Design a protein around this ligand. Structure first.
Ligand SMILES: OCc1ccccc1N1CCOCC1
Length: 282
């Protein structure tokens, strides 16, 4: 079926939970043996969210190459994304090592450091120009260059330096600051505006390594971001945009990381975002 009218048909029939459970039943199951090794317990935020072995990002290190991060490679859309958990106190250096090694231009953050009164990820970037951060375990230096605070999101320019080679690179930090503590946003308008700002920066384009996207677990809000982006790109590329099947695209992405889209409300919000976004594109 088309999307907008499939949408109204699920709303009128109140069957979002049944649609979402079908997705969960059909989703791929692949091994994640490296994630579950005992030496990696303090590298995982949640015991039930792990990268598959076949798609995990490897750190360029001979001691321990593990990080909770996955490469989502979308062949028809010609887009790639790295989805990862919010960094932990003992993985902030690994996180920036990955950004460096994978040649990423942008980092997309969809959570606040504290939500619901608890810590959802480490404070992994510097908050003042004159107070830079040094990650001694991976030999990197990170400096805040500039910050632009808007009503729904903040954009930061950061300098990452590889202290072994003295090479430097500019990294863009795109921080969506207004996702509610509970539920999903009422309107997708600010989320779409944010997606378009990431696109306009070049961070999603083939001349750079894949964008790094995270929330707390790296599957819920993060899944919504890449699902909406890929669906809108396919609607631009194809002769028949009504052929784009958002449930099929989501199942394709779940071949590369488990659990993408965590609730039926996130599934409905993804439909809403793609539907509204397709009208603005034209
Ligand atoms: O002072 C912050 C800092 C500087 C350099 C390297 C690591 C850190 N931490 C680690 C713990 O999590 C917060 C960042």
């Amino acid at each position: 079926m088309e999307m907008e009218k499939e949408f109204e048909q699920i709303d009128k029939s109140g069957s979002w939970a049944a649609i979402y459970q079908d997705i969960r039943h059909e989703a791929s199951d692949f091994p994640s043996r490296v994630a579950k090794l005992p030496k990696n317990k303090n590298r995982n935020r949640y015991r039930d969210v792990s990268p598959f072995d076949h798609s995990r990002i490897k750190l360029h290190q001979e001691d321990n190459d593990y990080i909770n991060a996955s490469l989502i490679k979308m062949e028809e859309a010609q887009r790639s994304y790295i989805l990862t958990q919010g960094p932990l106190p003992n993985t902030v250096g690994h996180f920036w090592e990955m950004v460096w090694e994978q040649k990423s231009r942008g980092v997309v953050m969809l959570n606040r450091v504290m939500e619901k009164g608890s810590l959802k990820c480490a404070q992994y970037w510097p908050q003042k120009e004159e107070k830079e951060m040094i990650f001694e375990d991976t030999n990197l230096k990170l400096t805040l260059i500039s910050e632009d605070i808007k009503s729904y999101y903040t954009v930061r320019q950061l300098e990452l330096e590889n202290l072994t080679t003295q090479e430097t690179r500019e990294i863009l930090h795109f921080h969506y600051t207004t996702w509610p503590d509970f539920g999903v946003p009422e309107s997708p308008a600010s989320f779409l505006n944010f997606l378009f700002k990431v696109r306009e920066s070049g961070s999603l384009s083939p001349e750079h390594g894949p964008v790094v996207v995270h929330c707390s677990a790296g599957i819920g809000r993060s899944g919504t971001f890449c699902l909406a982006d890929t669906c809108l790109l396919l609607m631009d590329k194809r002769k028949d945009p009504s052929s784009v099947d958002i449930k099929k695209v989501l199942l394709e992405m779940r071949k590369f990381r488990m659990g993408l889209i965590q609730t039926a409300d996130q599934l409905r919000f993804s439909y809403l975002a793609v539907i509204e976004g397709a009208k603005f594109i034209m």
